[PDB]
Amino acid sequence: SHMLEMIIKPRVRGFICVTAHPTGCEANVKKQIDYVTTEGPIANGPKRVLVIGASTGYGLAARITAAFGCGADTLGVFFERPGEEGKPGTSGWYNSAAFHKFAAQKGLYAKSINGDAFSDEIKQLTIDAIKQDLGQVDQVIYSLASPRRTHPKTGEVFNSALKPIGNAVNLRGLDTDKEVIKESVLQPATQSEIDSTVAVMGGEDWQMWIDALLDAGVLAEGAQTTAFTYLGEKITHDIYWNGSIGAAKKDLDQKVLAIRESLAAHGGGDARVSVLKAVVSQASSAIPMMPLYLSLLFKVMKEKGTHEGCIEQVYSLYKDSLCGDSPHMDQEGRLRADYKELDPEVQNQVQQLWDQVTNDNIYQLTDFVGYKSEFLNLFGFGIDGVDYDADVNPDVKIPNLIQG
Ligand SMILES: NC(=O)C1=CN([C@@H]2O[C@H](COP(=O)(O)OP(=O)(O)OC[C@H]3O[C@@H](n4cnc5c(N)ncnc54)[C@H](O)[C@@H]3O)[C@@H](O)[C@H]2O)C=CC1
Ligand SMILES: CCCCCCc1ccn(Cc2ccccc2Cl)c(=O)c1
Ligand code: NA
Numbered sequence: 001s002h003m004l005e006m007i008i009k010p011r012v013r014g015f016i017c018v019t020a021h022p023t024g025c026e027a028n029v030k031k032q033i034d035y036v037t038t039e040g041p042i043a044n045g046p047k048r049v050l051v052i053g054a055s056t057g058y059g060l061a062a063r064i065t066a067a068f069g070c071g072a073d074t075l076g077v078f079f080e081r082p083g084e085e086g087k088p089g090t091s092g093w094y095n096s097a098a099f100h101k102f103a104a105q106k107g108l109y110a111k112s113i114n115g116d117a118f119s120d121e122i123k124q125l126t127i128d129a130i131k132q133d134l135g136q137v138d139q140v141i142y143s144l145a146s147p148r149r150t151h152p153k154t155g156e157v158f159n160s161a162l163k164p165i166g167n168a169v170n171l172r173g174l175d176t177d178k179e180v181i182k183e184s185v186l187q188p189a190t191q192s193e194i195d196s197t198v199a200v201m202g203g204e205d206w207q208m209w210i211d212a213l214l215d216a217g218v219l220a221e222g223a224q225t226t227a228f229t230y231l232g233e234k235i236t237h238d239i240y241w242n243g244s245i246g247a248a249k250k251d252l253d254q255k256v257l258a259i260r261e262s263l264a265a266h267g268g269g270d271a272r273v274s275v276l277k278a279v280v281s282q283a284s285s286a287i288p289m290m291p292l293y294l295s296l297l298f299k300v301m302k303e304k305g306t307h308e309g310c311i312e313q314v315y316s317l318y319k320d321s322l323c324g325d326s327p328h329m330d331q332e333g334r335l336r337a338d339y340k341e342l343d344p345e346v347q348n349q350v351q352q353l354w355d356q357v358t359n360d361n362i363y364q365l366t367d368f369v370g371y372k373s374e375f376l377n378l379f380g381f382g383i384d385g386v387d388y389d390a391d392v393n394p395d396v397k398i399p400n401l402i403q404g
Contacts, residue, residue, distance in 0.1 A: 005391035008088050010381045015176065015285035017379045021388070022083065022396045024380025025094035026101070031383075032061060032311040033102055036068045039315060045070025045323040046139035046224065050126065052077045052117050052209060055092025056378070057281045058228050059143030061310035063099060065318045066139065073109035075129055075137065077117050079146075083394035091282070091379045097396045104399075109133065115404020117144055118205055120152045120212075122404050127216045129402065136220040139322075140213065142206045142227035145283065149200040152208070158199035161244045162287055163189035169238045172354065173288025174295060174368070176375075180359050182288065189244040201248035203227065203255030210259055210271075221267025225259060226274045226322065227252055231338065233347045235354065236278075239289060253332060260333075273334045274321070276313050277341040280374040292357070293350070295366035297341065300349045302367060306340040309374065313337050 008021045042065070049066040053059035054076030066072040076096065083089030096112050103110035111129055115122045130137055149158045163186050172183050189197070206227050213219050229249045232240050240246055256273045263269030278297060284290045301307035317337040321327040328336045340346070357365050376382040 002391060004085055004395070005393045006086060007389065007391060008394065009388070010376060010379065012177070016282075017375070019088045019379065020091035020094055021088070021380035021386070022094045022097070022392055022394065023390075024383045024386045024388075025091050026098035026380075027383045027386050028377060028380055029060075029064070029095050029098035030102065032064050033068050035311045036064055036315055039069075041071070042069040042315075042319045042323055045072065045318060046137075047072050048134045048137045048220065049074045049139045049141065050077070050130070050137045051075070051141045051143065053143035053145065054078050054112065055080050055096045057143070057145070057279070058276060058310050058314060059141060060092070060095055060099075061314035062141045062143060062318075064311060065314050066141075067103055067108050067110070068106070069315060069318060070323065071108070072139075073134060074103070075126065075134065076110070076112040077122065077126060078112065078114060079116060080114055083396055085395060088394045089396070093398075094380060094396055096401075097398045100398050100400065111400040111402070112398065113402045113404055116150065118146075118149045118152060119404075123209065123212045125402055125404055127212065127218055130218040131216070134218075136218045136223075137213070138220045138223050140209065140219075140223070140225040142209065142225065144205070145281070146200060149205065151199070158196045160197040160200035160248070161189050161193040162239070163187065163193060164238050164243045165189055165194065165247065171239060171287065171289045172292060173290075174292035174362070175288050176285055176291050176372070179362065181292065181357055181362065184288070186239070194244050194247050197244040197248045198251045201245060202251030204251075206252070207255050207259065210262065214262065219263075219266070219269075221269065223263055223266060223269040224322065225263065225271045226335065227256070229273050229275050229334070230278065231275050231342075232278065233342060233350065235347070235351060236293065239287070253334070256333075272321075274317055275330070275334050275336045275338045276317070277308065277338045279309050279313070280371060280378065282378060284375060291368075291371055292366070295362075295368040295371045296350045296353050296357070297346070298367035298370045299365070300346050300353070301340065302370070304340075304346065306346075308340070
């Protein structure tokens with residue numbers, strides 16, 4: 001039995017943790033659930049929810065909130081690697097296995113579709129699941145983060161870029177492997193890289209989902225859809241909001257209008273771009289600026305009593321703005337959950353510390369310790385009450401998983 005089981009430890013390759021611990025991921029999911037149930041139910045939420053990008057990060061938190069906060073049946077869509085003998089699956093795989101297990105315990109419906117959400121086939125498999133099981137869905141959460149997209153009509157592979165626009169930028173960062181504060185210069189994106197990034201992370205595919213669901217008659221009256229976005233502090237603007245990724249996020253703002261239009265005539269449904277705060281995610285070491293920014297932001301926010309991760313953010317997004325009597329709206333019609341990160345005093349303190357951090361004062365000036373812990377937590381490592389010495393079977397199976 002030892003031959004099919006293994007001891008799983010973190011292994012980090014090229015800033016990527018390439019292992020995930022099944023028991024730890026389960027404890028992580030359970031902790032997020034217990035948060036939602038500890039805070040209490042959310043009134044007037046959707047009862048039948050499709051989450052696109054449902055296995056990790058913000059879409060996972062949306063699934064947990066909808067299910068265990070609003071009592072929803074949830075259909076999740078993601079792209080994850082199952083575990084096998086000697087070869088741990090991805091954290092999102094284990095997270096969803098744990099979700100299905102906890103949902104079934106509470107008597108809630110949980111079905112998932114593993115495959116490319118950008119494809120027509122997966123959209124068709126999703127429609128079929130809704131038709132067979134749910135009739136219609138009341139809410140569609142759009143929470144994909146992807147480096148690439150295969151266009152479903154032309155077959156063209158688009159690659160997203162994380163580059164400024166216009167001028168090259170000098171970005172201070174933290175290299176999490178060598179633990180050094182260091183700067184690098186990123187060249188500006190070509191028009192082609194900008195359009196490719198808009199193709200991947202813009203709002204076309206969100207549009208195609210909502211249209212396909214409508215064309216099939218699977219969206220309830222008064223339905224609702226939201227796609228997640230980030231605006232960030234002024235310090236992130238050159239690389240994010242005003243870079244190639246920001247061009248994609250701005251495309252979301254041009255898509256959301258024809259979406260709200262569609263659903264508002266449809267029983268007064270609604271659509272909103274939802275703005276969330278920066279958190280540690282699987283990609284956080286995409287660019288070394290993110291670990292440094294998060295390390296600083298965590299420290300400053302912890303001092304103010306305002307630090308949160310995915311579950312806290314999305315719980316109050318549902319409670320205050322998606323289902324709540326007083327939505328927190330901006331001037332563009334976006335829903336905002338990110339205001340504690342953007343508070344002037346937080347930005348100012350983050351900025352003052354930014355020009356002071358060196359290799360020697362990282363632990364005195366920042367919550368790098370907290371960054372590292374949350375990063376390991378994502379993959380099911382460093383969690384309380386988990387025995388990391390016990391053998392585990394990496395081949396964890398999921399009931400009602402449609403493999404696309
Ligand atoms: N991470 C952050 O600090 C912030 C993220 N957001 C936005 O939130 C959204 C969610 O991102 P995170 O939670 O960070 O990402 P994540 O990496 O944790 O989750 C991405 C989800 O997309 C799924 N996925 C990726 N490619 C897919 C494909 N081709 N087909 C089906 N599923 C696919 C993954 O399986 C996963 O369930 C993105 O729109 C992101 O820009 C908003 C503000 C801040
Ligand atoms: C300096 C820190 C800037 C970003 C912090 C917030 C954040 C984190 C992750 N993501 C996801 C993401 C980020 C960059 C490129 C592609 C993708 Cl999908 C976001 O969209 C936003
Ligand atoms: Na997500």
